[PDB]
Amino acid sequence: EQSRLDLFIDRMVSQRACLEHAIAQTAGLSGPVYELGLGNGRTYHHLRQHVQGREIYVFERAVASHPDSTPPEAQLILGDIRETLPATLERFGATASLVHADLGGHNREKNDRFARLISPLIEPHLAQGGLMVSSDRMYFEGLEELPLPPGAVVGRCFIYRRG
Amino acid sequence: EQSRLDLFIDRMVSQRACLEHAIAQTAGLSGPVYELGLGNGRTYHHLRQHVQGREIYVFERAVASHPDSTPPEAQLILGDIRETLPATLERFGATASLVHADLGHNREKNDRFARLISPLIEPHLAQGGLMVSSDRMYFEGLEELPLPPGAVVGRCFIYRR
Ligand SMILES: C[S@@+](CC[C@H](N)C(=O)[O-])C[C@H]1O[C@@H](n2cnc3c(N)ncnc32)[C@H](O)[C@@H]1O
Numbered sequence: 328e329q330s331r332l333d334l335f336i337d338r339m340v341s342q343r344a345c346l347e348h349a350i351a352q353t354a355g356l357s358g359p360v361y362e363l364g365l366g367n368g369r370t371y372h373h374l375r376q377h378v379q380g381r382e383i384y385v386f387e388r389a390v391a392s393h394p395d396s397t398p399p400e401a402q403l404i405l406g407d408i409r410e411t412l413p414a415t416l417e418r419f420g421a422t423a424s425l426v427h428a429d430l431g432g433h434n435r436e437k438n439d440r441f442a443r444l445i446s447p448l449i450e451p452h453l454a455q456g457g458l459m460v461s462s463d464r465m466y467f468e469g470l471e472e473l474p475l476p477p478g479a480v481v482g483r484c485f486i487y488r489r490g
Numbered sequence: 491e492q493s494r495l496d497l498f499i500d501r502m503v504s505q506r507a508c509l510e511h512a513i514a515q516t517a518g519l520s521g522p523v524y525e526l527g528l529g530n531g532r533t534y535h536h537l538r539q540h541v542q543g544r545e546i547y548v549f550e551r552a553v554a555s556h557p558d559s560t561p562p563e564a565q566l567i568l569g570d571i572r573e574t575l576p577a578t579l580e581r582f583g584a585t586a587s588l589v590h591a592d593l594g595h596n597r598e599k600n601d602r603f604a605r606l607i608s609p610l611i612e613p614h615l616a617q618g619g620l621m622v623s624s625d626r627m628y629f630e631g632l633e634e635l636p637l638p639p640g641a642v643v644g645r646c647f648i649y650r651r
Pocket residue numbers: 363364365366367368369370371386387388389406407408409429430431432
């Protein structure tokens with residue numbers, strides 16, 4: 328049995344491990360990193376520190392980030408990702424190197440329904456060799472699930488790749 | 491070079507390690523556990539899974555936690571702690587086994603607040619009672635204990651009556 332504190336710690340530790348791994352594994356790609364969900368902005372802040380030589384675009388419906396974790400307007404894609412993902416695909420095509428999602432709220436069942444719904448909206452964005460890291464199990468057609476790196480906790484984050 | 495994600499992992503890992511150790515060290519005491527600040531209720535949810543044979547009272551200004559991490563009405567002490575700690579002292583006396591606080595990252599404000607609440611908290615502790623905090627505290631007669639394995643020095647603190 329795990330508390331909500333144990334789960335939150337395991338989530339953050341897994342994000343850090345999975346994102347650092349995913350950045351390294353995609354360092355030969357030059358397309359952007361997509362951050363789905365800004366929130367307080369901790370993973371965005373982490374990405375800004377660890378991503379070199381790629382842009383980071385942030386998808387968010389309402390910006391309320393800690394001030395030092397706020398994306399510049401040019402890299403903010405504002406609105407509901409159910410509309411903005413398809414709009415962005417027309418703009419940038421299948422060029423993303425890394426897509427990170429931490430879109431979940433407090434209700435795990437709602438989170439899983441949303442993961443199901445958004446999976447086919449995310450999949451077309453990835454370049455060949457691109458990775459997708461999520462704090463929800465995803466429902467992709469073509470992306471292969473990868474084994475987790477050291478430090479990650481099974482069931483907290485999931486990693487997928489466009490082969 | 492630590493990011494905000496690195497810092498918050500260290501905060502939460504240290505809080506958990508300190509709290510679990512503190513709960514165990516005070517498991518022989520029958521007086522209640524006081525949680526100062528509910529917030530989203532993750533820490534309260536943790537306390538519920540680990541504290542045995544004692545009540546948990548939560549001090550909060552206004553409840554904003556999901557139902558799954560909200561204490562029962564009877565264990566919620568609502569209002570500004572400058573008032574509610576002294577009011578609680580008249581009600582329950584120096585019987586608390588464990589008092590826990592996370593402050594929330596600005597050095598000077600936190601420190602002034604730690605100085606403000608230290609003398610409010612101190613009289614509540616029963617003999618053998620512990621106080622666990624995210625920030626350095628300023629007690630008259632409580633001794634600082636070593637950190638347990640897993641806690642990051644400077645990110646959490648433990649004191650004892
Ligand atoms: C858990 S918070 C993100 C926390 C972040 N990863 C961090 O480390 O601080 C989830 C965020 O996703 C956003 N979000 C959820 N559904 C969305 C949607 N359909 N479109 C755009 N943003 C959404 C929320 O508004 C919220 O800011």
